Amino acid sequence: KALYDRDGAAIGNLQKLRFFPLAISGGRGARLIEENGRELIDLSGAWGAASLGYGHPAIVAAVSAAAANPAGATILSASNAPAVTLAERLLASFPGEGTHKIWFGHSGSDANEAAYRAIVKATGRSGVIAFAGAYHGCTVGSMAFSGHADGLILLPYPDPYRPYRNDPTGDAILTLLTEKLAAVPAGSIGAAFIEPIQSDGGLIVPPDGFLRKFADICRAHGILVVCDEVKVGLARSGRLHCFEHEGFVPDILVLGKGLGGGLPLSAVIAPAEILDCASAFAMQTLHGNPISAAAGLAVLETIDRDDLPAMAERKGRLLRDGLSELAKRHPLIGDIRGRGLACGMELVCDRQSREPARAETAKLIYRAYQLGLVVYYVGMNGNVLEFTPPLTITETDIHKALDLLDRAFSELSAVSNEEIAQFAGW
């Protein structure tokens, strides 16, 4: 009878990543509306896909006009204007050069896979560098180089809070890279996949200067540098593109989630020679469909119009300030990290040992949900709170979210172990 019960009866568990019985019938701004009418503040923004929140007027206007008069439904066998305009608008925002083209998909998973397959096709080099704990997607293609393909080389992420080999600079990781590359035929690696802030590892910001150095090693060895900005892309970091923080330009940019503002949309920006090496090669019927592209353009127009990178920079300091405020009261909070409105809070059993507090995290978000706050956890040990709110979240929503979070830290023990065992999580 209840919506959550009906979901359990109609929808298989295969795609479920449930942390609590959240059941939604509506949405407005940064709020989700449960079946009964209860309002929750969404600090997850659907893992960041709701870039502009819910029922944003520019999304509404864009998608309504597109549905009323659609330019076909595909970029495959026809050129359509909404997609072409979005392609140029994405091209404009990327420097360079260039000589770059767009490939459109439904998701970050299909875009990382396309990027890979295009590289191997265009160059003949099938080897891949990727980072341990990396999330590039859940398709057979994009999982092949995600964390636990032949010629896959996995490197530790440059994690300040847990430095590889206890070297805080990351120099040991670059040294490992170097040892790994010479154990493998010269010119055999075609690509290096990089998250500028590692999402699934625990929203990890790498040590300053590391990515630039890593890219320089890559460029010196013929290896194309692919920046997977699905989670942290498009203004979320407080800059239009997250690599703008790291003093390097990737050869390839992968975009997703927040790009569609609520509709399935991803994109690969890659040199023309990579995307033109084949035709009818990586394709799905509704790729570059006009309704998705219209929303995508409404996201970009709104980013520019509202200076959303500047907003995300502002609202992110406000959010991190408040979280530090909570650390001063709650010993579980070991680490606050992030850029713009991509923030991570690591919870630990002891601030010195930095041992992961998995059970408390699960109880925390469950309680948070009961209090009216939607936040999920992420990370290797399930101990990292992830904050990726709508970019249009108001300061008033953030203060309210902080008060509810404070309350959830204090009221955590209320959550029974059997309540938590109802929900498999990751």
Ligand X SMILES: *Cc1c(COP(=O)(O)O)cnc(C)c1O
- Which of the residues 103 through 122 are near ligand X (CB under 6 A)? 107-109, 112
Report the b/e string of 226-239 with b at 16+ CB within 10 A.
bbbbbbbbbbbbbb
302 counts as binding ligand O=C1CCCCCN1 under rule CB under 6 A: no
Q: Was 157 annotated as part of a binding site?
A: no
Nearer to ligand X, 133 or 190 (CB): 133
**Residue at shortest CB range from ligand X:** 108
Residue reference for tokens 């026809």? 78
Binds ligand O=C1CCCCCN1 by CB under 6 A, chosen from 51, 142, 199, 302: 199
Report the b/e string of 148-181 with b at 16+ CB within 10 A.
eeebbbbbbbbbeeebbeeeeebebbbebbeeeb
Binds ligand X by CB under 6 A, chosen from 56, 136, 245, 339: 136
Are 204 and 337 in contact by the 8 Å Cβ rule? The answer is yes
Q: Which of 135, 164, 366, 377 is catalytic?
A: 135
Do the strands 266-271 and 127-131 form a parallel or antiparallel pair, or are they unpaired? unpaired
Residue 222, SS3 per DSSP: coil
Binds ligand X by CB under 6 A, chosen from 34, 159, 228, 335: 228
358 counts as binding its own copies under rule CB under 8 A: no
Query: Residue 379 touches which of its own copies, ligand O=C1CCCCCN1, ligand X, none (CB < 5 to 8 A by kind)?
Result: none
Nearest distance in Å: CB 17, ligand X: 10
Q: What is the C-alpha separation between 163 and 169, in angstroms, rounded?
A: 8
The answer to whether 135 is a known catalytic residue is yes
What are 348's two structure tokens? 């630990």
What are 320's two structure tokens? 């991190």
Which of 303, 292, 235, 304 shows the shortest CA–CA distance to 267?
292
Q: CB-side exposure of 314: number of CA atoms within 13 Å?
A: 11
- Annotate each residue in 262-301 with x if it binds its own copies (CB under 8 A) or - if it does not, as one string: xxx-----x-x-xxxxxxxxxxxxxxxxxxx---------
Cα Rg of the chain (Å, integer): 21
Nearest distance in Å: CB 252, its own copies: 11
Give the footprint of ligand O=C1CCCCCN1 on this chain (CB under 6 A).
17, 47, 76, 135, 199, 283, 285
Could you give the residue numbers annotated as active site?
A: 135
Pick out the residues of the known binding site. Answer: 108-109, 135, 228-231, 285
Pick out the residues of the known binding site for pyridoxal 5'-phosphate. Answer: 108-109, 135, 228-231, 285
